[PDB]
Design an enzyme around this catalytic site. Structure first.
Site, PDB file in Angstrom:
ATOM      1  N   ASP A 146      15.586  37.147  18.352  1.00 41.86           N
ATOM      2  CA  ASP A 146      16.133  38.347  19.088  1.00 41.86           C
ATOM      3  C   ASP A 146      17.304  37.852  20.037  1.00 41.86           C
ATOM      4  O   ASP A 146      16.887  36.795  20.834  1.00 41.86           O
ATOM      5  CB  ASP A 146      14.942  38.927  19.882  1.00 41.86           C
ATOM      6  CG  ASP A 146      15.203  40.124  20.628  1.00 41.86           C
ATOM      7  OD1 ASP A 146      16.482  40.566  20.896  1.00 41.86           O
ATOM      8  OD2 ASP A 146      14.554  40.901  21.110  1.00 41.86           O
ATOM      9  N   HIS A 173      19.501  38.836  15.805  1.00 37.44           N
ATOM     10  CA  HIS A 173      19.911  40.294  15.978  1.00 37.44           C
ATOM     11  C   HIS A 173      20.380  40.494  17.376  1.00 37.44           C
ATOM     12  O   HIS A 173      19.832  40.031  18.360  1.00 37.44           O
ATOM     13  CB  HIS A 173      18.713  40.899  15.446  1.00 37.44           C
ATOM     14  CG  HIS A 173      17.460  41.076  16.306  1.00 37.44           C
ATOM     15  ND1 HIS A 173      17.391  42.015  17.650  1.00 37.44           N
ATOM     16  CD2 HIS A 173      16.072  40.659  16.041  1.00 37.44           C
ATOM     17  CE1 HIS A 173      16.271  41.914  18.118  1.00 37.44           C
ATOM     18  NE2 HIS A 173      15.477  41.057  17.341  1.00 37.44           N
ATOM     19  N   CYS A 184      14.051  47.535  26.284  1.00 40.61           N
ATOM     20  CA  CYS A 184      13.236  47.788  25.145  1.00 40.61           C
ATOM     21  C   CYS A 184      13.416  48.986  24.594  1.00 40.61           C
ATOM     22  O   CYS A 184      13.861  49.805  25.138  1.00 40.61           O
ATOM     23  CB  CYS A 184      11.630  47.714  25.665  1.00 40.61           C
ATOM     24  SG  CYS A 184      10.604  48.383  24.253  1.00 40.61           S
ATOM     25  N   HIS A 186      12.043  51.317  22.952  1.00 42.53           N
ATOM     26  CA  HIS A 186      11.249  52.171  23.046  1.00 42.53           C
ATOM     27  C   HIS A 186      10.846  52.546  24.517  1.00 42.53           C
ATOM     28  O   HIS A 186      10.035  53.087  24.997  1.00 42.53           O
ATOM     29  CB  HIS A 186       9.908  51.819  22.331  1.00 42.53           C
ATOM     30  CG  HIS A 186      10.253  51.460  21.216  1.00 42.53           C
ATOM     31  ND1 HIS A 186       9.943  50.301  20.554  1.00 42.53           N
ATOM     32  CD2 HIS A 186      10.697  52.432  20.155  1.00 42.53           C
ATOM     33  CE1 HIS A 186      10.331  50.194  19.415  1.00 42.53           C
ATOM     34  NE2 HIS A 186      10.935  51.378  19.131  1.00 42.53           N
ATOM     35  N   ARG A 221      22.035  45.712  15.126  1.00 41.19           N
ATOM     36  CA  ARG A 221      20.984  47.045  15.675  1.00 41.19           C
ATOM     37  C   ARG A 221      21.565  47.865  16.499  1.00 41.19           C
ATOM     38  O   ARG A 221      22.652  47.507  17.203  1.00 41.19           O
ATOM     39  CB  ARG A 221      19.700  46.342  16.514  1.00 41.19           C
ATOM     40  CG  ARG A 221      19.114  47.134  17.507  1.00 41.19           C
ATOM     41  CD  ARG A 221      17.978  46.690  18.087  1.00 41.19           C
ATOM     42  NE  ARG A 221      17.562  47.137  19.419  1.00 41.19           N
ATOM     43  CZ  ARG A 221      16.302  46.912  19.994  1.00 41.19           C
ATOM     44  NH1 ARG A 221      15.557  46.034  19.779  1.00 41.19           N
ATOM     45  NH2 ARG A 221      15.981  47.533  21.135  1.00 41.19           N
ATOM     46  N   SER A 308       6.989  49.561  14.960  1.00 43.48           N
ATOM     47  CA  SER A 308       6.760  49.115  16.370  1.00 43.48           C
ATOM     48  C   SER A 308       5.361  49.334  16.847  1.00 43.48           C
ATOM     49  O   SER A 308       4.657  50.506  16.584  1.00 43.48           O
ATOM     50  CB  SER A 308       7.732  49.985  17.390  1.00 43.48           C
ATOM     51  OG  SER A 308       7.495  49.626  18.664  1.00 43.48           O
ATOM     52  N   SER A 310       4.921  50.073  19.788  1.00 44.25           N
ATOM     53  CA  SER A 310       5.196  51.184  20.863  1.00 44.25           C
ATOM     54  C   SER A 310       4.968  52.516  20.135  1.00 44.25           C
ATOM     55  O   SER A 310       4.860  53.418  20.865  1.00 44.25           O
ATOM     56  CB  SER A 310       6.430  50.947  21.197  1.00 44.25           C
ATOM     57  OG  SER A 310       6.665  49.851  22.145  1.00 44.25           O
TER      58      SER A 310
HETATM   59 MG   LIG Z   1      14.459  42.489  22.466  1.00 42.82          MG
END
Ligand SMILES: [Mg+2]
Ligand SMILES: [Mg+2]
Ligand SMILES: [Mg+2]
Ligand SMILES: [Mg+2]
Lengths: 415, 417, 415, 417
Positions: A146, A173, A184, A186, A221, A308, A310
């Site tokens: 990430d 990413h 985040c 989410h 993304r 996820s 989440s």
């Molecule tokens: Mg992240």
């Protein structure tokens, strides 16, 4: 002109790069490399191994890891990739040492420190197995890390990408959020970059990968599904979504949803090897929608999906969940990952153990140990904890240095 | 000068804290080494005071090894009254080189202090979330007891390491009588003892550092002399009782390893430490009773420390073990490698689940996490757990509340949790 | 309500805070502190000592330091503050280990690592002097550290400020540039934040200082003198300067110059203890202009001035230069600093030594050593290099631990 | 397996690199310890090959201690052909604890490798600026020779440290025969020698690590036995010639310190190292000649290393010293603490200047910097020096050249320089 050749060549002539634009020259890259070439074995074999796997497997499912031990169990369990979550690092593994939410709060070299951690653990696991000749497990499994929004501008992204490769990531990413208000996927209050600014980040990452001489996999993304704010109206492409309303901060209100996600996805797709739409729930219909739109312009684009934590994978039905990954690999989602598996695994396990222990002392602990012993036959070696960490490997180093005469060898005499 | 020497001199003679403790140096020496100002170390003081108090108040204090803030955080939440910080766990998964190492002092010497600081910053953020919401009275500032191994070198490396532990906010620190260049896990072979006089010098340097740092940090003297059948040297008259005469190629001396060599060491160290710990090869009640009886004959009431090690096969069903040995004086009890077994077994079970049944294996963990909530487990609500609510409160205070980009309001944690 | 009291009280009733707005409550600060108070001795005595000095001295001149040795010589030379340059850290002292330009490229906890470095060096210098009773120099001299634009948003600034105090900085400086396009004051392509966004950074820093319970000095810097770009037209206050022209990136062209610098200076002044105008040359007239405008609304505001090595202090006249600092302290510039003194001192010295050495070997080196010996009588102790680093301090620790019986004491037997 | 063992076996028997070097282990042992893949370490290889070559090509190679990238960078620019990396300097001003320490192995063990990596990243950025502009043919990749002290512990800490040096891109590494827990600067008292057999084990572990890392890193065996009048033990028959019988409280043994104890050590180590270094208390030509003659009787042509220390009063006017001792076999010569004296004296002179004459003292330095440009000094143009031009070239390539926020065009470095 000959180092430029063995670069411009690869681009033209390597299937690896079919449907990938690079709007700079091989001349530009070699101008920025400096006067010599530095090999990065781990990041190169990694990038190659992940690229192979994504074309030879039905799909590749990963779990988030915030330690090398955690990643070693993923690999001994038979997973073929590792997901390095920026959330988890923020939560429990960043160079500041603080627990943070997922708002790019930590120092920007934190994730690459965790990639090097993981590869150093895997190497030790490989060194132990090699010395013994006890198994043929390939511990060098690709790590996908990430890079959030790059922790600032085009040059931060560049530096970060270089860092990820130095560390030995196989894939990175970048998300089209504003580094300064990054959240985040989410969470609320997401702020998009102009499409062109998100495209410059992706060129930056690839140029960095090109200077480093490594075919690192780049995941684009989009947060454009929930994100209903953007920093500027400057790109004609985005004017299609802005209301003209503005917040106090100055940001522009936007029509979030699969339309905006799709607009970003086709824009980023010529600059990425995978495309990833952050979603607010695991809706098969939306996953299929998203895929089709990409595939019309980008036939057989490898897609990525965050299964996820989440989401409540239960309020979702039981047989649909057992088959979800196979179901979405169908649409083209060949890289799938549970972002926060390591955070929940780690907190749940220690809370249930500490509570068993408070209530029933070593009886509780003997349940874990017994659970550990039963798991040996499935490939869990960590029950024999001294071997797991390479006590035997360093004994063998001591015997080689001393020509066998060492009396302070560790394992012989152990209880 | 006489000002600061006397607050110090007073406390050494008056506070019951230092009863049965020798200092072979003076307050004048301590103030000579401090520098011209007194720097406060709030979390190290408050922790040392809390850990001491609770050792004289509870039947006993039992801990598990923590190797991350989150782990320590779940241990406090579950009701435990101290955190053990394992150097073994740090070697394996949590040191500043980023390598997986076996328990042999190969990691950089400032590693455990870094993990101490990590754990403390996690606990501080846990309190801050509780404070802001006025939503529970939990004390998240629980004493950390930290592994200083054999100090990573001589008497000066010990001094420095002991200072690092305190700056990072450790409440207790343990030093062991092994040679640093040959250090091992307690339960491996090829342990080499330091001469007794040398082990005593290290605990003295440890107390000098805490006195110089002006903090009443707890010191645990650990002995490895139950299994360790080598000593670096025959220099100390006290050690000649156990030396066989046989020398190794390296020049080490053979000793008669056993409970007696441990009792010898325990009594040498008891004057220079707040607890004493005998490493053992099995959970043996009669060794623990004999070792305690031998220590209590010379220091009645001395606090003792027991490593309930995962290197032992907890199939001793004759639990009730902690209560039994706590009755012998073992007030501080800890499972050194709990964090490593918890983390390692946990991800392996989930990963195997996941390879086999995909997101169904994940759903089971989520649903086990919801089930733990009635016990007081909150990490299933993970945006709140890492302080997303706390940083939205920071944002609202800075903007006077016009902030458009606050995080929780319009998160999947509002709707779906 | 009693910890809130001994805070709200100090604000009302402490001259330290005259002409300072805090648009939050003492209730807000205590809500964010958590349930206990942690003392930060060094940062508190520092903040107090710098505040005293700035009111009891004609002015305070500093040099940039990127090592603790460098800062120790500043203090042994008789300087009463230390300047921690973000440029120098970027160049030679950041946690990434890279040489960077001054574009916020390094990890955001790099400067606070250097502040802790410097204070740890000074403490050792104090420990040696204390043990000996050889002198009465106060080695705890205030450090004033560069926080650039905060490395992202309002929450990064907050975290950074907390970091600076933890480290034991006595003062911090935030600039009204965009973190994402941040530059050296004396470079092109500067991009301003909306005035309100630069004011939110300053509130953030002060709230952080308030939560940490420390009266840290906050310097507001403006780049508005050269900076001819801004990120948004959202603040009415800035519309006065925008042309309406826009770059491709989306930024807004602006009328740079002393007018824009002055607009920012009066806006930031209620939120800072010092105000600092980055200038393109050392123009006395502009310094006086800038000061007067501030003083009309903010009588006796402490001002700050970068006597920049990016200027040619010779193309400027010789008697004007000898008197510059005294001359501008006149207008109210009570904190003055040569940002890059340490970078030029370090590179010039090693280049001239390496060249002397290449050409004439140890003869060259004996010139430095002889220069070192002649400098002893002026307070240069570093010629006796073992004492300088505390060899004597650790001998005394060894004698205390061993009760004097040590045979491996270092200094006795030294050549 | 036989594949990789043989490339290795070949090179040991054929390459003139390993002439007069013993390995008491096999290629099979090296490949058993490597792991299943070969990882390349470009800068460590290219550096070791360059340093070796230039040691057999130049009258001699002379270096100064560097403690920052910038310092190393000015040393290359000025025409020097290697960089010395002092552990003393790292103790004082450049270690990962951030403390000022004296030369006694108190810093974290991964500190010098960090400074090695720093220096290499600075040199890489210097090349990149040169490359981009096609503006000079300078080789900025000059060999770094790094201080591994006495390894920070035993044979395994040495192994690890030697691997760290190589990953960071060191070309050469030196190990000394002191006890790590008692390590000192060469020119302080209270040095304690390791038994010879023990010093040999460390150089063997050092060669195993470089063989395992597959890099021909240069190893410099250093002896402290000229001034060091203690040894940890009487275990090694070779050391009995120098042991008096007197023991210390700690149990160390008195030895007859001198050139003879050094010659004994130098000849023990010469088979296991690429250069040999005798630490000395004064710049004495006849000791250097005798030590060289004693080494060349058994290893004719052996490369020798001389520390031209700042702990000596360079008032030996009988310069011409480097040429003289280079004629004795001393090919690698270095001034250990040059970086510390340069940095420290430099800021003190400027700061005193500044207190006294304000910006007039600064102007003098600027004007001295302009004067150095004809010698090839560029740091007075500081935005270019740290690669502002390089990051504007990165910006222009990313934006296709529409970038509005490029830095140099419209900088005070354009107008005023
Ligand atoms: Mg992240
Ligand atoms: Mg341990
Ligand atoms: Mg700056
Ligand atoms: Mg040294």
């Amino acid at each position: 002109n000959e180092r430029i050749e063995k670069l411009q060549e690869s681009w033209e002539l390597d299937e690896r790069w079919e449907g990938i634009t690079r709007p700079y020259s091989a001349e530009d890259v070699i101008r920025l490399r400096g006067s010599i070439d530095i090999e990065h074995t781990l990041a190169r074999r990694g990038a190659e191994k992940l690229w192979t796997s994504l074309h030879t497997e039905d799909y590749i499912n990963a779990l988030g890891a915030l330690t090398g031990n955690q990643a070693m169990q993923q690999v001994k369990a038979g997973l073929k990739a590792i997901y390095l979550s920026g959330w988890q690092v923020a939560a429990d593994a960043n160079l500041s040492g603080h627990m943070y939410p997922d708002q790019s709060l930590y120092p920007a070299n934190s994730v690459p420190a965790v990639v090097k951690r993981i590869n150093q653990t895997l190497q030790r696991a490989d060194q132990i197995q090699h010395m013994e000749g006890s198994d043929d497990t390939d511990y060098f499994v690709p790590i996908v890390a990430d890079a959030e929004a790059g922790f600032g501008g085009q040059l931060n992204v560049f530096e970060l990408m270089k860092g990820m490769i130095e560390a030995g990531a196989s894939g990175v990413h970048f998300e089209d959020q504003l580094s300064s208000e990054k959240k985040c996927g989410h969470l609320g209050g997401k702020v998009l970059l102009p499409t062109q600014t998100a495209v410059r980040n992706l060129i930056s990452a690839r140029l960095a990968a090109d200077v480093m001489g490594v075919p690192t996999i780049i995941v684009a993304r989009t947060d454009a599904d929930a994100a209903d704010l953007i920093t500027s109206d400057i790109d004609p492409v985005d004017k299609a979504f802005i209301t003209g309303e503005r917040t106090p901060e100055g940001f522009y209100r936007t029509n979030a949803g699969l339309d905006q996600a799709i607009a970003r996805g086709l824009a980023y797709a010529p600059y990425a090897d995978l495309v990833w739409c952050e979603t607010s729930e695991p809706n098969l219909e939306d996953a299929k929608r998203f895929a089709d739109a990409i595939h019309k312009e980008h036939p057989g684009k490898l897609l990525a999906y965050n299964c996820s934590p989440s989401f409540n994978w239960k309020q979702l039905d039981e047989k649909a969940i057992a088959s979800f990954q196979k179901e979405i690999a169908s649409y083209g989602y060949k890289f799938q990952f549970v972002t926060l598996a390591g955070f929940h695994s780690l907190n749940y396990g220690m809370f249930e153990l500490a509570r068993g222990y408070k209530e029933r002392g070593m009886a509780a602990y003997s349940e874990l140990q017994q659970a550990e012993f039963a798991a040996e036959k499935h490939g869990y070696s960590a029950t024999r904890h001294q071997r797991e960490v390479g006590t035997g490997y360093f004994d063998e180093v001591a015997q080689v240095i001393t020509g066998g005469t060492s009396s302070t060898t560790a394992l012989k005499g152990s209880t």
